[PDB]
Amino acid sequence: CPLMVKVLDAVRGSPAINVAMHVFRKAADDTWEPFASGKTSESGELHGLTTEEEFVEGIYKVEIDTKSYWKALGISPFHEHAEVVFTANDSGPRRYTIAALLSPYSYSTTAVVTN
Amino acid sequence: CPLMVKVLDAVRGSPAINVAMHVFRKAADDTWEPFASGKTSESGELHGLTTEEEFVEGIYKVEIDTKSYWKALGISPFHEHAEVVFTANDSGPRRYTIAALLSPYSYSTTAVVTN
Amino acid sequence: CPLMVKVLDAVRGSPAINVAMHVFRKAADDTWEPFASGKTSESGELHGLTTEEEFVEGIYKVEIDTKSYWKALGISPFHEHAEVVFTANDSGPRRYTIAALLSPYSYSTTAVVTN
Amino acid sequence: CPLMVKVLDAVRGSPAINVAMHVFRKAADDTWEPFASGKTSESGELHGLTTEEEFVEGIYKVEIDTKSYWKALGISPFHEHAEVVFTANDSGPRRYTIAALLSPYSYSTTAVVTN
């Protein structure tokens, strides 16, 4: 699994469950083409977005739909979504974990890159 | 000053100086049109982006060029840029402060909305 | 002002007001002796904790009563308090700003050390 | 496993490996008694600190030795250590995961509490 996302909720002290996210890849004409999408499980994890063959070099954007997550819980948050934009596989294949911690007016994201 | 941005460097424990950013407003056709831009000062702050008359309700995107910042320090970063995407909503007098804390593989952002 | 603390609320997107904290200095027998204390202002800031003459090199602990803050908002928090423990070291003129961003089950803290 | 700790490094984009930590529990005389200790594995995780029987109600402090971690990597950080202080098992047994993200001048911690 070369691209996985883990999301935690800092208000409830729990995984962030049912968070939708869309992944895009920058096309040669510099537009964002849809690449993969999914939602976090009961563990706050989203696996199986892509494969080693399909996950070629490029610039990728992970849009985490944090607004829909908070609204579904009856909370009005600040951000529309959280964005994680990065060049992937520039030096050969890597495995990426994107971790996110969500509050209504704040979020943090970090990346774990392994070879 | 209805919109200010402050950027901090978590590696050096200092304001992030000379960090360029652009602010976009979402248009009716869902494109991002330029709205304002600048570079952070020696205090890591960027003031004077817009005025109350101009800063109407809408969806705004702040795109922070974190990659050039790390590159100029000789450090290889993960992210192409940091994005902060939010709705401005009229609810009493509201000043927006967007803060971003930068590390090579991570960033945190929070909003302080005051009266 | 060689030592200032700023506290933000990530649930409400606001300064954390009336947050009490104590600062301790480590003594030669490894106990923590009281050094300074106060409560954050309406801007979430606590100034005037110490002076340059008094703020000598040493290990300092800032103990922030985050639990009382959340309790007064009707929210059950995880942490008993937030601690920031650091060494003050003379390297040019150095002002210390300690920032803490509070959520019920999380906190982030950073230091900005300027000249 | 009722108490586990996961630590990530925001500078290297990796688990934080070989981070030492000491856990203390507040005794009836209000002193901190040593409870458990360990170091994070290659995955940045520390398991096996305690057992369900031994992990009774109380106030616990997890001291994460972030200074030794950064120094061992030749970096001079701000904090002496990161502290996580919390009441555990007040409403019956729970499982706690403490997650931490480390930068030289900043850290974030969050808690995941499951039943």
Ligand SMILES: CSc1nc2cc(Cl)c(Oc3cccc(Cl)c3Cl)cc2[nH]1
């Ligand atoms: C893939 S299993 C897993 N490892 C984790 C490591 C950490 Cl640090 C974590 O918390 C965070 C995740 C993102 C930003 C911050 Cl600021 C924090 Cl604190 C959750 C984690 N979940």
Ligand SMILES: CSc1nc2cc(Cl)c(Oc3cccc(Cl)c3Cl)cc2[nH]1
């Ligand atoms: C209301 S104006 C304001 N000044 C600030 C100074 C600091 Cl250092 C601050 O910290 C942070 C900024 C971003 C992420 C994190 Cl994780 C933290 Cl901790 C927030 C601030 N907001």
